[PDB]
Each structure stands twice: as C-alpha cells, then as structure tokens.
UniProtKB/Swiss-Prot annotation, chain A:
Has 3 domains that are structurally very similar to those in BoNT/A; light chain (nLC, equivalent to the light chain, residues 1-408), N-heavy chain (nHN, residues 409-829) and C-heavy chain (nHC, residues 830-1193). Gene3D superfamilies: 2.60.120.200, 2.80.10.50, Clostridium botulinum neurotoxin b, 'coiled-coil' domain, Metalloproteases ('zincins'), catalytic domain like. It comes from Clostridium botulinum. Keywords: Disulfide bond, Virulence. Assembles with botulinum neurotoxin type A (BoNT/A) and protects it against pH-mediated inactivation or protease activity at pH 2.6 (the pH of the animal gastrointestinal tract) but not at pH 6.0. Necessary for neurotoxicity. Residues 374-785 are annotated as: N-heavy chain nHN. This is Non-toxic nonhemagglutinin type A. Residues 1-373 are annotated as: Light chain nLC. InterPro entries: Bot/tetX_LC, Clostridium_toxin_transloc, ConA-like_dom_sf, Nontoxic_nonhemagglutn_C, Toxin_rcpt-bd_N. GO terms for biological process: proteolysis.
Length: 1150, 47
C-alpha cells in the first residue's frame, strides 16, 4: 500500500529516504532506504557476519555463497522484493496494524544527562542521524537462514527497547507437503519478534521450554526452545504451554508487566504534555502504550496465517530440519510473487528449482550403520538434528506445578492516528546505543551407530537410486546386497505385478499401446499407494495405511503389518515407550489459623480451597498433555514425515518409469509427430493425477498416525495421570478429614456435612475429551489446504444486483468465465438459474483440468429445465477439440451423452424423456479407477456402463454451454475432479430440494394469485372439476371419459398481500373462477365444496413430502385432504385421515 | 448478506454481495454468520 515505492538501488542519496549510514561503531558503512516511518531496508548482506566461514562452522542445511547479493542487479531485485512483501503485508488490515505498531514502537528515550533517543542511524560524517526502529538486511553467511537481532542487548531486556536488525531471504522458498512457504509470513515472523526487542521485553536466554524429545538418540536428551520463539512461531505446539489455567510460569511475565507500567508512568507524568519534547516522539510513545504487554505475548503466526489465508507448517515448526530435507525454489518478483502473494497460490505456483540445492551443507546428527552377520557395512544413512540447543537436563522431573497462582492483539492499534504523526526529524542521539555485534559460531557433532536391524531411515534410503536404469524389488536385503547395483526398494505390489505381466510382450509401438500401458500404470499405483484397512483398536476404529510396515520396516517382521498392529496397539510403532516423569507437586496443608473459625467463615474458606484444588488438577493434566506432545507425538510425527517421504520416493520412481517410456517412444518410434505431441500433453496430465493420488495417501498416513498418537494418550499417558490423581486426592481427602475433626468451634453435625461438601472423587479429574484431542490438528492451515484441494473444479453461482446480473465460480480454482452480456437470470430450484435463449447466448468456462486426459476422473452435474421443441441433435454443453472429449446433446425428447477418444472409440448414450419442461437433476460420473460411467437423472440411476474401452479423451481447457436451438434454464452447474456415488447424488438432490418452497407440477415455485389446475397423485392425468348435487357445488375428478366436465381453475390466496411464493406450513385459502369467485369450505360430511363467501372460507395448511418434489399436501385441524371412494360415479375431495398415503399427494399444473 | 467491514478502525455492519459469491462453510470464520441472544432465566445477568 502506501509503503514508499519511489526507490531503486541507484536512487541518489537525499539524506531523507536514502542515506549512507555507519554500521554500529564499526568502520563500515552501508546504503539504506526508508520504506516507511522508522522502517528501513538495507539491500545488502548483513555487515556483521563474515561471508566466508571455515568449513567446521557451516551449519547443517545451510547454503553459503559469498558472491550472493554482490551485484547491483541483485541488490535492486532484493530492494524491490522486500518493498513488494511489505506492500502485501500492509494490504491486509492485520498486517497493516502490525507495521503501524512497529512504526510507532520507538524505544524509550533516556533522560537529561533534552531527552536522548537510542534509535537512529548515524551518517558517516557523524553529523546527521536518522530515526529507525527496524532495518531489513539480506542474509548473513548462511543465505537460507532468516534472523532477528537486537541493537543493544541491555535495552532489549530492560523495558527501554532497542533497534532491531533483520536478516531476510526473499529469493528462496521450499515446499512443505503440498504448498510453498510464503516469504510474506516468514518476514511477519521476524517482525513480530522485533516487538519484543522494541518494547525491551526480551526474556532471558535461559527461559526455555521442552520442545522435542530426541528419540533418535540412544540416550535421553531434549531439544529446547526459548519462550519468545514458541510464542511467535505459532502452530499447534504453543497450545500446550499457553493454557487456562497456566501450568507453566516464570518471573519474566509478572516482571515484564511490572517494568512496562514503570515506563508507562514515567511517560504519563513526565513526557506527555512536556513542551520540551515534541509530538513526533511523545505522540508515538502514547501509541506504544495504548498496547498491553499481553497483546504481544498473544500475537503469533497462527493469527496472520488466518487473516492472510497463508498456509504454514503447523507442527514442531522450529524443529523441521530434523523431520525434513528442504529443497529450495527460486521466487521472482513480480512474476512468481506479487502483492496478492504467489501467482496461482501456494499450491499451484510454478517455481523453478534452485541450482543451489546441490550446495546445501549436509551434517548429520547421527549416522545409522547397517551391517550384516559378517559385521560388514551394507548401508550408511543420515539422520539430521533440529538445530536447537539441548537439555540440560530433564525439565519435567524438576519442574513444580505452581499451587499458588501469584484473540486479536492488534485491536488497540490505530492506523489513522499513527499515520498522522509527523516523522521524527530532529534526533538528539544517545552515544552508546549498541553492542559490538559478535557472530555465533557452531561446531556440529556427529554420532556413528551400528545395527544389524534396519531402521526406518535405512528402508527409506533404499528407495532412492541414481541409476538411470533400475528395477523395482520388494526384497530389502536383495536391494542393499545388490551385485548390480540396479535394484531399488519398493512396496508397490500392484505396479510390480503389472510390470511383470507385460515383461514378455511385444514392445510398445502404437500410441494406443502407450495409453493402455500408462493407464494401468496409473490405476495400479493408485491401488498400491492409497491402500487402507479399517481396524478395531483400544480407542476405536482407525483407518490404517496398509503398506506402512513394508515402507519403514516397522512391525515388518510378520507376514502382515496390519494384524500385528491390531494386536500390539498404537504404542508399538515408536522406539521410546516410557518417557513420562511424574511431576513434583506442592504438598497439601490446611492452615492452622482456621481451626477455630465459625461455620459460615470456615465453610466459604474451604470453598476457596476447593476451587484452587480443582484448578490444580487441571494444571497437572495439562503438564501430562505437554509431555505427551513433546515425548510421544513427536515420535508419531517423525513416523508421519518418514512415511510421507516414502510416498514421495515411490512416486518419483513411478514418474521416472513413465518418463523413460515416453522419452523412449519419442526417441525412436514410428508414432506420428502430432500423436507424440498429444502423448506428451496427456502424460503431463497423468503425472498430475499421480500427485493427486500421492496426496490422498499422504493424508491417509496423517490421519492414521494422528489417531494412533491420540490412542496412545488415552491408553498409555492418561491412565498414568489417573493413577497420580487418585493418590493425590486420596491424600487431600485424608488431610481435609483430619483437619475438620480438629475444628474446635463447630459441632459434630457440622463436621459431617463439611467433610462431605469438601471430598474429591475421580470424576473431579477425568478431563479426557477425545474430540478436543482430535481438534488439535485442525489448524488454519489444515483447513486452507482442505479448501484449496477439494474436488470442486467449477461451482457456478448467479444472482441479481441492481442493474447487474452476476455469474461466477466459487470453486476457488483458476476457472475463467466468459458469457453473453444479456444472459438473464430466473429463480430455479434453490437459486437463480441462467436463461439461454438458444439463439445467440452462450457461456464458457476455462480450467486446465477441463481438458481431461487418459487417467483423471470427473463428475458433471446441474439442474436443467428445457422448453422442449425440436427433436434435432443440438449441442448443450461439452468440451471438445480435435474430435475428442465429451458432449451432452439435446436429442428427440431426451439428452445424449457422448464420449470419444483419440482412437475413435465412443460412448453414445440416449437418456430418454428429459424435455418435459420440468426441472431435472443431471449427474454424470466418470471413474477411471473402476473404469465405470454412471449417469443419474433426478433420484434414478439411468446408465451404468464400462468405459474400459475409452482411452484418451483429451479435449480443450474450455467447457462450452451453448444450448443451441433449445431455450433452457441451467442451475448449479458443477464440475468435480472425483467420481460421484449414488448416496451423494440422493443427498445433493434432496438437500437442495427442501428450501421451504412448495412446487408446481414442473417443480417451479408455487405462487400465490396464480392460476393452476389441480391433480391428485393417483390419477395424474385427471384434473379436479366442480359438480353440483343439491343446489350447492362440490369437487371431483372425471372418470367418465370426456364427460365434458371442465377442468376447474384454482388460485391460492394468502392472508398477507405481500406474500408471493408458497412455503411449507403456510396458511392458505383456495379459490376458483367459475362465474364469480368461489372459495373452498369443508362440509359436515368432510366433503369439500365451493362457496360464495370468503369469510366462511376454511384456512388450510399447505406442506409437502420431502421425497416427492412436484407434489403437495393439504390439511385442516390435523385432518388431511384426499380423494374419496367411488360414489356417483364420482370421487369427491374429502377431509379424512383414513385413506392410502398416496391419495394425499396433489400437484398444481400451470 | 449482513456482515461487517473495517472503515478506518471502525467495524461497521454491512450488507455485501461479496458473501453471496462464497461457498457455504468457508473456514469457521465467516463474518456473515450471527447469533441471536434472548434474555433467558437460565443465564440471567443484569440487563
């Protein structure tokens, strides 16, 4: 937004927004650009760290380049990139507040020996000083590591506040699961942390909580994380430390709040209103103190993740180096990334791999040496540490849970007010405002350990080859003992089986043969990788990943991993089973000063102790939950990551196999040039289909393993808690009974009632909530991912704005819509429907998915009402190019669904009787895994066919809705990337159908004051007619064929003039036009008759059956309306409850 | 739909067709979803 855009690396020094300033007290100088008040960008490498460092000091996962950001071209690209990111952050209210706060957050000034500011940059000549809170540099030595440093440690810890330097890397990002890290949130993290430095609230380096149990190591060792980073970094982890009530504290919090008030006070009494100071400072201060210290502690990435709809890693996100090997991708501004973030979002952005990936330093935490019986090395695998500092030592054992207790954080930031504070111009500099910057040096220790039993990291490593030629094998021992060594380890049974079945076959020559091959390759991969089996466990039914044991070598010694896991339980999957440490408590003593109190006071004082206690219980439980997360979940998340890596390794093998075959045919075969062309385009789509299938599998292992971890809490941790708690309340119960007996000033009847009031039982501490356990893993990110990856490729919406008709796509995909300007909208079934006139009107939807291919599945559905005239075959909707793809046609009285591949194979299927000028729900389902086509009309399944004979349907990326020659209505058009089942169709159809509206015979909304004819469900072609008997007139139907009774004309009336459409439960008056207007009444015989006087008219309740879409029911005083027995012969309309259910269904036809 | 929008630092109740362009449940956080709280004997603070 209004971040300063006017800068380039060649911008001249103006001494206002572009300066050349000294770095701390060094001899070194650098150029800085002011992008916002008090906020500068210095587009070079951080000055404080040497660019070339000794090999011994290079950290794992680091990339070291001394010539990076050396050139002017690079520097500008940097400067623009940061400016771009700050613009994105400022373009959303949340991040706009963050920047505004940071801007006004200037550190507290020192006093006379008038006031001296510590936040400024010095000109080289040291006669000019520029206000700065924040300065953003490029990386230090390691060019993938962001950093946030303080100008002066003392001022960062003492409540004054200190300037903050940031080291940032806009040009590289990595993939985590299905998404790219968004540098915008990575920068927001650095910015949030600076808040701690600007306020002078930086905690001791020693204030540190347990993060991850290092379950990789033979010994007991924890990784720790400073409170600052935990609170800022977001994700799930913090939910365990930050709790209500708090089980974890430190003087830091209470003291920070204390000093903050001291400084606020110094401001209030002295600085504010002091004319010796000036607004650019005191006004900013006033805003800095509108905040509460708590607001900063409560502020973190999870909040911006949500406000910006940015995906971020949500679990152990400061330990990722251990769980993951990062692969870096280049980001170019603004081609890849702009003020709206990644072009095409974090999932589908097209980013190039960095050539730097090969320069990444690899320094394992430990190395797993796998030998054989002869003590010779088969394999050496790497395990990487998280980077965090460790122990020392065990926190849970020595931590006492305190018995005595002593959303939005940016709400109080005012953007308008802050933006009107003149910039700080005359600065009176405080001389020593900074520390000599001292670079951190780190030597990385590596452990070698030997095993005759393959670890998961071994089985993983065996799933990679650099061999251009390789063979899949299911024997791990054979793979690593290979005399080839061409073998690579694979669990894909269906794929390996298929590859073997075709081993002896004549080579692939036709394109048709390539497709048949590629398709079977795809189906089998899907079957292998998405395999799950539901099992009964201690805690329930879990959907188990079938190949898990064969992948990681876990419970793999059986012939089946699944049954062995059902047997041994969730805890059998991890290496360290007993990590718990019973926490140290605060022992229970009731004061000796209450011994003589009177009842009322004794009473209400034990009530206080009762609450403190039950709160204390809750704290203990929390402590157990944190240990679970740290000690146990950490190990299941390791399993999740390794399992996910296994899936990628396998996927890679598959793609390489496919790529080789395609590459080979293109290399030497007689296949036509443009057939090869199609093959190339098509295979690409198949490779996407393979990732989508891989993704389903990576979700499978996430649910499976998360459930397991939760089962371990119920089955293993929780019961240890319950043990500890009944020892605890057994004790408390004792001491409280002994206390009450020793009470002097109360009687014996009082003692018994009191002991009873104050006694604890197990229910007081049974806190397990399984739904809460499960909800832990639903983060903003998990949700965002769901919405980005759901099956909708097109969801058509339409509505009427004043003077405008709106049509759009809600799928959240890339769909582009182009349509005739004059297309009209009309209310359909549940919403506004598009009207196509058949002549000039058309609409078209564009999505790369729409082209289909060989291997993808999809569903098309929509509501359609056709004013049916001609029988002649006419395009309605379809996607076709080069005579491939699919089309739905109007033909005869029906539709035709057509499907045709590049080899000429066709589906041409007539769907009878769809143009009655009544709404119909069309569902078409194409399933390549089951090779099955399904076509539904309304609630019926009209076609079920094999499509094994249809191969490559690649079409354009455009679906065209033409509706040639047949004016029609189309509503709720949807495209899905998955097949549809019959349950889903029924659910879609009926759910949409009950919106409270009653419908006419055509399923259009029933209207008041509109003329209809009335028909009973049982005789559907016979309209109600009027007949007089004794000088008065009744309602019947015509069973004497052409007795020339005239169809009677009906109109529904409402007590409310403003009411237009008829709804479920409405009160109604039925009228008829004969000579005058006649209104319906009930006789004493319960036979309906037309009368003279609206006053006497009976008010009836109209309603409908949920499963009968075009029909309605009518009742009076609970008595429903139906057709009588034969009489005259005539069948009278009667109010009676004893007839067959079918006779109570009516419909109005206009 | 009736919802709210930030104008300066004020959150003003708004009718905005931007909602009608959205699919149903999106996140858990809508801005156009409301609750109607009647005075009830079961809660009973002082109005």
């Amino acid at each position: 937004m209004n971040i300063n855009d006017n800068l380039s690396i060649n911008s001249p020094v103006d001494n206002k927004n572009v300066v050349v300033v000294r770095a701390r007290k060094t001899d070194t100088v650098f150029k800085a650009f002011k992008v916002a008040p008090n906020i500068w960008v210095a587009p070079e490498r951080y000055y404080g760290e040497s660019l070339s460092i000794d090999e011994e000091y290079k950290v794992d996962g680091g990339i070291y380049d001394s010539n990076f950001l050396s050139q002017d071209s690079e520097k500008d690209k940097f400067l623009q990139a940061i400016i771009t990111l700050l613009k994105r952050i400022n373009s959303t209210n949340a991040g706009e507040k963050l920047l505004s706060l940071i801007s006004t957050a200037i550190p507290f000034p020192y006093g006379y020996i008038g006031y001296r500011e510590t936040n400024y940059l010095s000109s080289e000549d040291n006669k000019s000083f520029y206000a700065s809170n924040i300065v953003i540099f490029g990386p230090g030595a390691n060019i993938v590591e962001n950093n946030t440093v303080f100008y002066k440690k003392e001022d960062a810890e003492n409540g004054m506040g200190t300037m903050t330097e940031i080291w940032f890397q806009p040009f590289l990002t990595y993939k985590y699961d299905e998404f790219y890290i968004d540098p915008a949130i990575e920068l927001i993290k650095c910015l949030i942390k600076s808040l701690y430095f600007l306020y002078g609230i930086k905690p001791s380096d020693d204030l540190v909580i347990p993060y991850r149990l290092r379950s990789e190591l033979e010994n007991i060792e924890y990784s720790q994380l400073n409170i600052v980073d935990l609170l800022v970094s977001g994700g799930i982890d913090p939910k365990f430390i930050n709790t209500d009530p708090y089980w974890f504290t430190d003087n830091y919090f209470s003291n920070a709040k204390k000093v903050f008030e001291d400084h606020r006070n110094i401001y209030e009494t002295e600085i504010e209103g002091n004319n010796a100071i000036g607004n650019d400072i005191k006004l900013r201060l006033k805003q800095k103190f509108r905040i509460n210290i708590n607001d900063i502690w409560e502020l973190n990435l999870n909040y911006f993740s949500k406000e910006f709809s940015i995906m971020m890693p949500d679990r152990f996100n400061n330990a990722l180096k251990h769980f993951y090997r990062k692969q870096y991708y280049k980001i170019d501004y603004p081609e890849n990334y702009s003020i709206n973030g990644f072009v095409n979002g974090q999932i589908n952005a097209q980013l190039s791999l960095s050539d730097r990936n090969q320069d990444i330093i690899n320094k394992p935490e430990e190395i797993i040496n796998l030998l054989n019986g002869n003590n010779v090395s088969l394999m050496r695998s790497n395990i990487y540490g998280d980077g965090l500092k460790s122990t020392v030592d065990d926190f849970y054992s020595n931590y006492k849970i305190p018995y005595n207790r002593a959303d939005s954080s940016l709400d109080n930031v005012n953007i308008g007010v802050i933006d009107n504070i003149p910039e700080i111009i005359d600065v009176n500099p405080y001389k020593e405002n900074c520390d000599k910057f001292s670079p951190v040096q780190k030597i990385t220790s590596t452990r070698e350990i030997n095993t005759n039993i393959p670890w998961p990291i071994n089985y993983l490593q065996a799933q990679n080859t650099n061999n251009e030629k390789f063979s899949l094998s299911s024997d791990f021992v054979e793979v690593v003992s290979s005399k080839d060594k061409s073998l690579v380890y694979s669990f894909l049974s269906n794929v390996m089986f298929y590859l073997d079945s075709i081993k002896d076959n004549s080579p692939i020559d036709t394109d048709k043969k390539y497709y048949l091959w590629l398709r079977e390759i795809f189906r089998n991969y899907s079957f292998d990788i998405t395999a799950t089996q539901e099992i009964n466990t201690n805690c329930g039914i879990n959907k188990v990943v079938t190949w898990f044991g064969k992948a990681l070598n876990i419970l793999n010694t059986s012939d089946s991993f699944v049954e062995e896991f059902q047997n041994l339980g969730a805890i059998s999957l991890i290496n360290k089973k007993e990590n718990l440490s019973m926490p140290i408590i605060e022992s229970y003593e009731i004061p000796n000063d209450m011994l003589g109190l009177p009842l009322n006071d004794l009473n209400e004082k034990l009530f206080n102790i009762y609450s403190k206690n039950t709160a204390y219980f809750k704290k203990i439980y929390y402590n157990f939950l944190d240990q679970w997360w740290t000690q146990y979940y950490s190990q299941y998340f390791d399993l999740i990551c390794m399992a996910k890596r296994s899936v990628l390794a396998q996927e890679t093998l598959i793609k390489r196999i496919i790529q080789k075959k395609l590459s080979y045919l293109i290399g030497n075969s007689n296949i036509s040039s443009d057939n090869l062309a199609l093959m190339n385009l098509t295979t690409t789509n198949t490779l996407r289909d393979i990732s989508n299938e891989s993704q389903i599998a990576m979700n499978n292992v996430d649910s499976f393993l998360n459930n397991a971890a939760i089962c371990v809490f119920e089955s293993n941790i929780y019961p240890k808690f319950i043990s500890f708690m009944e020892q605890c309340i057994n004790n408390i119960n004792i001491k409280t009974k002994e206390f009450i007996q020793k009470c002097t000033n109360i009687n014996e009847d009082e003692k018994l009632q009191l002991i009873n009031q104050n006694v604890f039982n197990s229910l007081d501490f049974e806190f397990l909530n399984i739904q809460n356990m499960k909800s832990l893993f639903s983060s903003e990110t998990a949700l965002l991912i769901k919405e980005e990856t759901w099956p909708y490729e097109l969801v058509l919406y339409a509505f009427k704005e004043p003077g405008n008709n709106v049509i759009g796509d809600a799928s959240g995909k890339n769909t582009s819509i182009e349509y005739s300007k004059d297309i009209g909208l009309v209310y359909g079934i549940n919403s506004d429907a598009l009207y196509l006139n058949g002549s000039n009107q058309s609409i078209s939807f564009s999505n790369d998915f729409f082209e289909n291919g060989l291997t993808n599945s999809f569903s098309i559905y929509f509501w359609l009402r056709n004013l049916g005239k001609d029988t002649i075959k006419s395009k309605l909707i379809g996607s076709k190019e080069d005579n491939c793809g699919w089309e739905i046609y109007f033909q005869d009285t029906g539709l035709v669904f057509n499907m045709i591949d590049s080899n000429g194979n066709e589906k041409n299927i007539y769907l009878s009787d769809v143009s009655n000028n009544s709404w119909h729900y069309i569902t078409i389902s194409v399933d390549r895994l089951k090779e099955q086509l399904l076509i539904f009309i309304d609630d019926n399944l009209v076609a079920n066919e094999s499509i094994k004979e249809i191969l490559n349907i690649y079409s354009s990326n455009i679906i065209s809705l033409l509706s040639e020659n047949n004016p029609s209505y189309i509503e709720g058009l949807t495209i899905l990337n998955k097949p549809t089942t019959s349950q889903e169709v029924l659910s879609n159809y009926f759910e949409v159908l009950n919106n409270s509206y009653i419908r006419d015979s055509n399923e259009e909304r029933l209207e008041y004051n509109k003329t209809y004819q009335l028909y009973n469900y049982v005789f559907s072609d016979k309209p109600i007619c009027e007949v007089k008997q004794n000088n008065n007139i009744y309602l019947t139907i015509n069973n004497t064929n052409n007795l020339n009774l005239q169809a009677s004309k009906f109109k529904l009336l409402s007590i409310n003039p403003n009411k237009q459409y008829v709804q479920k439960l409405d009160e109604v008056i039925i009228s008829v036009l004969d000579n005058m207007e006649k209104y319906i009444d009930i006789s004493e015989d319960n036979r309906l008759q037309l009368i003279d006087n609206k006053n006497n008219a009976k008010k009836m309740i109209i309603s409908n059956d949920i499963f009968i879409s075009n029909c309605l029911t009518l009742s009076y005083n609970g008595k429903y309306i139906c057709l009588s027995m034969k009489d005259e012969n005539h069948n009278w309309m009667i109010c009676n409850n004893d007839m067959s259910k079918y006779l109570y269904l009516w419909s109005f036809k206009p | 739909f009736i919802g709210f929008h930030q104008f300066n630092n004020i959150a003003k109740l708004v009718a905005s067709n931007w909602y009608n362009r959205q699919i149903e449940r999106s996140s858990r956080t809508l801005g156009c979803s409301w609750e109607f709280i009647p005075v009830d004997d079961g809660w009973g603070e002082r109005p």
